Design a binder for this molecule. Structure first.
Ligand SMILES: Cc1ncc(C[n+]2csc(CCOP(=O)(O)OP(=O)(O)O)c2C)c(N)n1
Ligand SMILES: [Mg+2]
Length: 525
């Protein structure tokens, strides 16, 4: 049968038909004789490779298979893998390794200490000891990434292994299925349910793993029965709730003191699918005001152990959310009032304000559109001004790693052809993963790229305001032509220097059959 044939049989039997890669010499014996039932998505830089696969996996809610070249190709993808760890993203990262006979010699393209290079961003890293073990190793790689908490995994395979004969017992791997859909036992669950019904002013914090689980609808019901406000946890990688539902309270501030003040007055605070408050800024204070008890449901033991406060349960987010929403009694309390409609900012005929750009997206864009965010100074306004009523409608780099949104948008749009993907990316952020645009052109993935050009790293200048950071170099990015960049990679390029220009550009981009980039002149932060 051979390792090559057996592995490709194992991948299809495990449901994988797509390979996101940038080719290399160690990868040719694996890439050769490519099965007709598989499809290869090529990106020009390995950060783009993983980013595309990442968005594809997050929207599909299935594993994604990557093929990179040795250490150099693995190294270029490490920033993406960092984002891919904090988003519990099921990624099977494979890298070709030199012939076993020359690894000790360290011949050119040898990945030295290969399993250590991904760490500590990968749940599992491995280099098989024997060619016939490779399929088994791939099997571990798939399940490791698939099993909760979902995470990136790494497998280095010497290129001489693919032609060798596979183990005849490797066929037992093909139909292996491991379940993680677990929930709290009835006795402890009923205790929790009794505490939610007893709470006089409960509150719900929802994290990215809620959207990863597609537990949004269950979380809506739970919020309705509890008649409880709902916040999305800070540094949110995803949107787990309808942003215009009367219970939704918006994006929590990323500060210790600021979160405990918001939570003050709620006896029970139920967190689901979220790390227990990840803070960006140092806002020292009380983690919790007195009279507030916190219960956290998480798929990740690291999150449960990490918490500075509260109880925690390590279970499946989907199974827990569905159990809690169907078990709780409907509260007599009145439903919370929907947050106020956002105000319209003054907009002259000149450079566009971010608020105006987000309002124009909301009226113009489809109700089932998918948004992506790498405009770091405008996140607060984007959450307020974009009505996202459906799951899988928002993605933001989980670890804050720039270069995610542009390639990921191509991956999401590939995963969801029926939904229109609009990526709002700031200037400067677009540079990290710029080559990915080519993949959208070559495969005609019709992602819309909206570039917010202010000529600066807006968030960095704003933050340098918090604290007296004066005379900080490297904060301005003047003189980039994004329409020229989009042409270089074959993406149709549009511009928008005013509102009417923006309105027209958007209507055109929505009608386009190919990818489109719109460079937007925006006002400085
Ligand atoms: C890979 C990486 N490099 C650098 C940073 C630091 N960083 C955080 S926000 C930011 C500015 C982003 O620029 P832009 O898209 O213009 O954002 P805005 O003007 O909206 O703040 C930078 C450089 C990062 N988070 N990740
Ligand atoms: Mg900017």
């Amino acid at each position: 049968a051979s390792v090559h044939g057996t592995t490709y049989e194992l991948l299809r039997r495990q449901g994988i038909d797509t390979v996101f890669g940038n080719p290399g010499f160690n990868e040719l014996p694996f890439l050769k004789d490519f099965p007709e039932d598989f499809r290869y998505i090529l990106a020009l830089q390995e950060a783009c490779v993983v980013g595309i696969a990442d968005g594809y996996a997050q929207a599909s809610r299935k594993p994604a298979f990557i093929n990179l070249h040795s250490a150099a190709g693995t190294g270029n993808a490490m920033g993406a893998l960092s984002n891919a760890r904090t988003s519990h993203s099921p990624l099977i990262v494979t890298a070709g390794q030199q012939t076993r006979a020359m690894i000790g010699v360290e011949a050119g393209e040898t990945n030295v200490d290969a399993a250590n290079l991904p760490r500590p961003l990968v749940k599992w890293s491995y280099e098989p000891a024997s060619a016939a073990e490779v399929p088994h190793a791939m099997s571990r790689a798939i399940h490791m990434a698939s099993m909760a908490p979902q995470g990136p995994v790494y497998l280095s395979v010497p290129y001489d292994d693919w032609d060798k004969d596979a183990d005849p017992q490797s066929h037992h791997l093909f139909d292996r299925h491991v379940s993680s859909s677990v929930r709290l036992n009835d006795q402890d669950l009923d205790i929790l349910v009794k505490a939610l019904n007893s709470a006089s002013n409960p509150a719900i914090v929802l994290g990215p793993d809620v959207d990863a689980a597609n537990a949004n609808a269950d979380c809506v019901m739970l919020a309705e029965r509890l008649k409880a406000p709902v916040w999305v946890a800070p540094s949110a990688p995803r949107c787990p709730f309808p942003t215009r539902h009367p219970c939704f309270r918006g994006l929590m501030p990323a500060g210790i003191a600021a979160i405990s003040q918001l939570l003050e007055g709620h006896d029970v605070v139920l967190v689901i699918g979220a790390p227990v408050f990840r803070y960006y800024q140092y806002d020292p204070g009380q983690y919790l005001k007195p009279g507030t008890r916190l219960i956290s449901v998480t798929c990740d033991p690291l999150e449960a152990a990490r918490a500075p406060m509260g109880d925690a349960i390590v279970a499946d987010i989907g199974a827990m959310a569905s159990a809690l929403a169907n078990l709780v009694e409907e509260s007599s309390r009145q439903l919370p009032t929907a947050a106020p409609e956002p105000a319209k900012v003054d907009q002259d005929a000149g450079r566009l304000h971010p608020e105006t750009v987000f309002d124009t997206l909301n009226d113009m864009a489809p109700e089932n559109a998918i948004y992506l965010n790498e405009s770091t100074s405008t996140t607060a306004q984007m959450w307020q001004r974009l009505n996202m009523r459906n799951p899988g409608s928002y993605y933001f780099c989980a670890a804050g790693g720039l270069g995610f949104a542009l390639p990921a948008a191509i991956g999401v749009q590939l995963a969801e052809p029926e939904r229109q993907v609009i990526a709002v990316i700031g200037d400067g952020s677009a540079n990290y993963s710029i080559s990915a645009l080519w993949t959208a052109a070559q495969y005609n993935i019709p992602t819309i790229f909206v570039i917010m050009n202010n000529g600066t790293y807006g968030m960095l200048r704003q933050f340098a305001g918090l604290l007296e950071a004066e005379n900080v170099p490297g904060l301005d990015v003047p003189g980039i032509d994004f329409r020229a960049l989009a042409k270089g990679y074959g993406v149709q390029a549009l511009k928008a220097d005013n509102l009417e220009q923006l309105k027209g550009s958007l209507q055109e981009a929505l009608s386009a059959k190919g990818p489109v980039l719109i460079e937007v002149s925006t006002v400085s932060p």
